[PDB]
């Protein structure tokens, strides 16, 4: 079994993964589930080997005994010296984003507003904001804080899914995959853009990448980053240019996880797939580009330069950092997740 | 070591080999094992010298350090001028064959149909089809693709062996030798003919040789090649007459393999045995015919005119060709062979 089985979340990821397999000569093959949690179960059971996860999902994989292998790396501010694969990773910036023409809306007037979330359990979409809201209100009732939300992966019957749109035909509302119109960094921003929500919980990069002709998609085509502001924790609003002083927190980068027994194999194969199909890939763009989709962050973020090595011998705890682990642990006391309950005994 | 020890797969091949030995004055001697893999292990151990193999099996022999000696050669379309032994080899046409009266069945509707295979690891039976299926689906789960199969050599407990019938008393179901009813080119076609399966993976020649009174066997006696069609890769069906435009791939011809140290010896001896017992053999048909069995392609294909010389100094790679080698290597990423694991350990 030299093939590395990649877990694709949803049918759009599955098409890119099938492409990847064909061009990889089955050095990579595809399993699919409708959700990230399902894919974490596939890797647990050895029906799949790996997938690239948001840090919040890495927490779930970690509790279930999976390990981080390689981290997403985007273009930094300084070094063009060190190779991308050896270059220190820079955490992305979790921001709350509002329309500039919705004056009166601050961090402190968020209660019973409409929210857009990348999905439940994701770092910028959910762990960071809802962690802060629960901590500030001293209440576990984050499910009643917003009047209405789109938070893919929530209970589809609840107000947390009220604003989710699903497919073109409106099927699979609130399913935490890319077939849901408002799923992900893209989808949550599109949710704020089409004014379905008052606030979107996304990362700094998402705002830039979908404004001022930077995206070619018809909803994002004619968007100006002047029509948007960033809610800061100090109550103030600011332009999207001052993310560095107006962000909720710094997220650890999306990273690949595997079973321990498969990590070395998965690492070696990916370093080589990156060399062939990465940013400066021998076979990118004529054959296949690993880090490009229909600008819909399939398998990897489209802004991924390469997958980088980590420190020596890292656990999910070391990778995410003690602080973000404690913030997650605390928010999770207000909830139960099936996978966290199922796997709880492994790290207790 | 002037004796050439021939490896016979199964007891029917052993009877023909013993006959051959007797008539050869022990210029040829017989070893037997129950499977082709077992026979390749005998040659590895020096407990035998040689046998005639399908190209897929030649890949396994090759990885275990064996070399090709002489190729099967059947009647071509053009030259009756050049001697058979000097005449370029053409190589056979791997086809998917259906009943014409199973309308709706194309290459693209094959999933969870019933399949018939010559055996696991054979070129037309397995490598070509399952290579294409795995590449198209981007999945290594070829074992779950068909609902049920007969693929001799598969796990006898699995669905890949579900349709295999064994011997007349039903013993040794799925054993990859001629005692299994649906073993080989003949057996896989008989599997389609008796409607045990919806598709058979065989070569062009097998269809012709068992239809329109061409075979005298009771299952093949009353078969019309109008009641059969060829699945093409472009989705279309076609008559068995247009194999040239409706084939999965071109297979390298079955060929004799030996240890490197034994190739020249085995070559010299066989050229002479062919002269005595081949198609226009001095002693064929009054004493012994090397290229005739009880219509069971024993040791050699019955459609073999002679064994032909190869180009100067060919490896298994050069003989099978870079493209078919790549296809095999890629399908083998989805599997593990103990024999290939052992041989990697003891060729390095
Ligand atoms: C699919 O994966 C295989 C397995 O890794 C890839 O082929 C392998 O590529 C490596 C690295 O380039 C080769 O290693 C080389 O060894 C030679 C010494 O013989 C050295 O000169 C090179 O510097 C390098 O270390 C290796 O030959 C090769 N392995 C095999 C088994 O073929 C292949 O590129 C991948 N294909 C795709 C489409 O991803
Ligand atoms: C917030 O997100 C945006 C989008 O990722 C970040 O803007 C990016 O900033 C970097 C500098 O750190 C720019 O990199 C430059 O790339 C060009 C070539 O593309 C090159 O000429 C320079 O050498 C440099 O490396 C990048 O262009 C820019 N992206 C966009 C679309 O404006 C920004 O850094 C993030 N903000 C914070 C505070 O982290
Ligand atoms: C698919 O397989 C069939 C069966 O092997 C092939 O048909 C065979 O074609 C050969 C050579 O073209 C025929 O030989 C011919 O024999 C006559 C005299 O017997 C001679 O005048 C010709 O010059 C030629 O040598 C052979 O009889 C025929 N066999 C049958 C049973 O039909 C067919 O060629 C293969 N298809 C492709 C596309 O390769
Ligand atoms: C696998 O399929 C794709 C398209 O279907 C093709 O481009 C690729 O070369 C195929 N691989 C092989 C080994 O044929
Ligand atoms: C057997 O081999 C010897 C030695 O090469 C040769 O002279 C003889 O003609 C052969 N006999 C048969 C039956 O092939
Ligand atoms: Fe994230
Ligand atoms: Fe064959």
Swiss-Prot record, chains A, B:
Q: Please name the source species.
A: Bos taurus
Recorded protein name is Lactotransferrin
Processing and modification events after translation = Poly-N-acetyllactosaminic carbohydrate moiety seems to be needed for TLR4 activation.
Q: Which residues are glycosylated?
A: 27, 135, 204
Task: Enumerate the spans annotated as Transferrin-like domain.
Answer: 4-333
Q: Which amino acids does the record list as binding hydrogencarbonate 2?
A: 118, 122, 124-125
Q: Which gene encodes it?
A: LTF
Q: Which residues of the full protein are shown?
A: 361 to 708 of 708
Q: Where in the cell is it found?
A: Secreted; Cytoplasmic granule
Q: What is the lineage of its organism?
A: Eukaryota, Metazoa, Chordata, Craniata, Vertebrata
Indicate the quaternary assembly. Monomer. Found in a complex with LTF, CLU, EPPIN and SEMG1. Found in a complex with MPO and LTF; interacts directly with CP, allows Fe(3+) incorporation into LTF and activation of CP ferroxidase activity.
Q: Which family does it belong to?
A: Belongs to the transferrin family.
Instruction: State the function annotated in the UniProt record.
Output: Transferrins are iron binding transport proteins which can bind two Fe(3+) ions in association with the binding of an anion, usually bicarbonate.
Cysteine-cysteine disulfides:
7-39, 17-30, 64-343, 84-306, 116-191, 140-334, 150-164, 161-174, 232-246, 284-289
